[PDB]
């Protein structure tokens, strides 16, 4: 109940309290006769008679409500920190149940000490939280959480995000071609601002679409991080199970002694530790069958060469079916160049609008959304197969290239040029890395020659 009455960051405290309870049960079992700690834990979690326990349901609830729309990712530190201004407070969590200190860590002093110890994890989510979640959710919790996350992503992409994209497409310029380098960086910036002026004045872009984009990016980032944690846990388990599965390391070999003989001698020395063969030699038929099944389960894990992000990416791509994402066929029959009927142009417009240096009394994009917005946009672009087109066709990239070529700095419409191009440089550095990562996870048309007349 205490775990259910707090946010997701209380998972470490819950794990510590569960460890304390397990230690108490072990101590008491010396004289008394109680059920196994697993049975009591499952009865309390209601997982005995249900596929999913209370812990996994609460984790999913928190992920849906408080985690995704409030935490902004930071790739440099691989940590999550809460948004400077919350855009969601309707969580309405339960009331903390009071109880005697004994039911808690054991005493007032012990409770205070443990609260102080676990108070450092309250304001961030990181590898420790992910590994604790994996340990507590086994495989069922991860599977159900990822299924619900996929459902939420499908609902968001085909719902509010789709309507906002459709609305923004109409206001976008009918045709927009990158200006030549002769005009110069200031004229090009002025032209881009005039062409995209209507997008800038739009207010809901930075409060709903951006928010939705942040929600879809945090979900995918959580999926990626959870998988890595699971893989690490599996590798540790595999390392522990080597002695009982006849798995040995590469033993040192010296001149005069052959590797094969040394390995054979080492295996012979560890022969008693082997379980399966030993059980077969001295075991009942039922025991042997159970042992074989257990060994098989122990040796087969997802870390043995099974990937899981590719399926999620394919499902997200399949969720994109509206023609607005790709638009009509090109007039020239090869690709769109001038027309802005593709989502990549809209993403470029978003980058241009939120790359403008904001004042001192307002938050920036990173402060509120962090890297979730960029991750979501890059994922969408990659799944739409327009990363190369986006890189070639982009207002910010062309403006930065022209600024570098000419090297000018002017205050064009209350917008510094050098700071804007530096921000564009940083953002494209981030976008390139994100796109490269996405492409690394996921991995013709012939024309006719002219005919004489």
């Amino acid at each position: 109940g205490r775990f259910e009455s707090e946010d997701l960051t209380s998972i470490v405290e819950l794990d510590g309290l569960l460890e304390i309870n397990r230690m108490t049960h072990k101590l008491l079992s010396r004289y008394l006769t109680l059920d196994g700690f697993d049975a009591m834990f499952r009865e309390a979690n209601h997982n005995v008679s249900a596929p999913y326990g209370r812990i996994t349901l609460h984790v999913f609830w928190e992920l849906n409500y408080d985690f995704l729309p409030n935490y902004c990712y930071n790739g440099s530190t691989n940590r999550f920190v809460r948004t400077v201004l919350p855009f969601s407070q309707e969580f309405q969590r339960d009331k903390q149940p009071n109880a005697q200190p004994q039911y808690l860590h054991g005493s007032k002093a012990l409770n205070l000490a443990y609260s102080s110890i676990y108070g450092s994890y309250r304001n961030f989510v990181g590898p420790p939280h992910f590994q604790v979640i994996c340990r507590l959710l086994g495989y069922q919790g991860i599977a159900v959480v990822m299924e619900e996350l996929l459902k939420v992503v499908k609902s968001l992409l085909q719902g509010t995000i789709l309507q906002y994209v459709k609305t923004l497409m109409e206001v976008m310029p009918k045709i927009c071609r990158l200006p030549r380098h002769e005009y110069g960086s200031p004229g090009i910036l002025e032209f881009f601002h005039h062409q995209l002026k209507d997008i800038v004045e739009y207010a809901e872009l930075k409060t709903v679409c951006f928010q939705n984009l942040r929600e879809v990016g945090n979900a995918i980032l959580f999926c990626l991080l959870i998988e890595q944690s699971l893989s690490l846990e599996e590798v540790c388990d595999l390392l522990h199970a080597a002695p009982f599965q006849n798995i040995l390391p590469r033993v040192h070999v010296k001149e005069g002694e052959r590797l094969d003989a040394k390995m054979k001698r080492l295996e012979s020395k560890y022969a008693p530790l082997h379980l399966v063969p030993l059980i077969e030699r001295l075991g009942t038929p039922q025991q042997i069958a159970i042992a074989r099944e257990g060994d098989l389960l122990t040796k087969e894990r997802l870390c043995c060469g099974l990937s899981m992000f590719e399926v999620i990416l394919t499902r997200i791509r399949s969720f994109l079916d509206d023609p607005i994402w790709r638009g009509p066929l090109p007039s020239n029959g090869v690709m769109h160049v001038d027309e802005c009927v593709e989502f990549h142009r809209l993403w470029s417009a978003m980058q241009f609008v939120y790359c403008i240096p904001v004042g001192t009394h307002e938050f920036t994009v990173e402060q509120c959304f962090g890297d979730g917005l960029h991750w979501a946009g890059c994922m969408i672009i990659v799944l739409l197969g327009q990363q190369r087109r986006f890189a070639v066709l982009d207002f910010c990239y062309h403006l930065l290239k022209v600024q570098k070529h000419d090297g000018k700095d002017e205050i064009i419409k209350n917008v510094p040029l050098k700071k804007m191009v530096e921000r564009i440089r940083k953002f494209q550095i981030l976008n390139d890395e994100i796109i490269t990562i996405l492409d690394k996870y996921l991995k013709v048309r012939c024309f006719q020659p002219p005919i004489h007349q």
């Binding site: 349901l57 999913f60 609830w61 159900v144 619900e148 459902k151 939420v152």
Partner: peptide, 8 residues
């Protein structure tokens, strides 16, 4: 999602 209904 529907599991949200169930937990509610």
């Amino acid at each position: 999602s529907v599991l949200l209904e169930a937990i509610r």
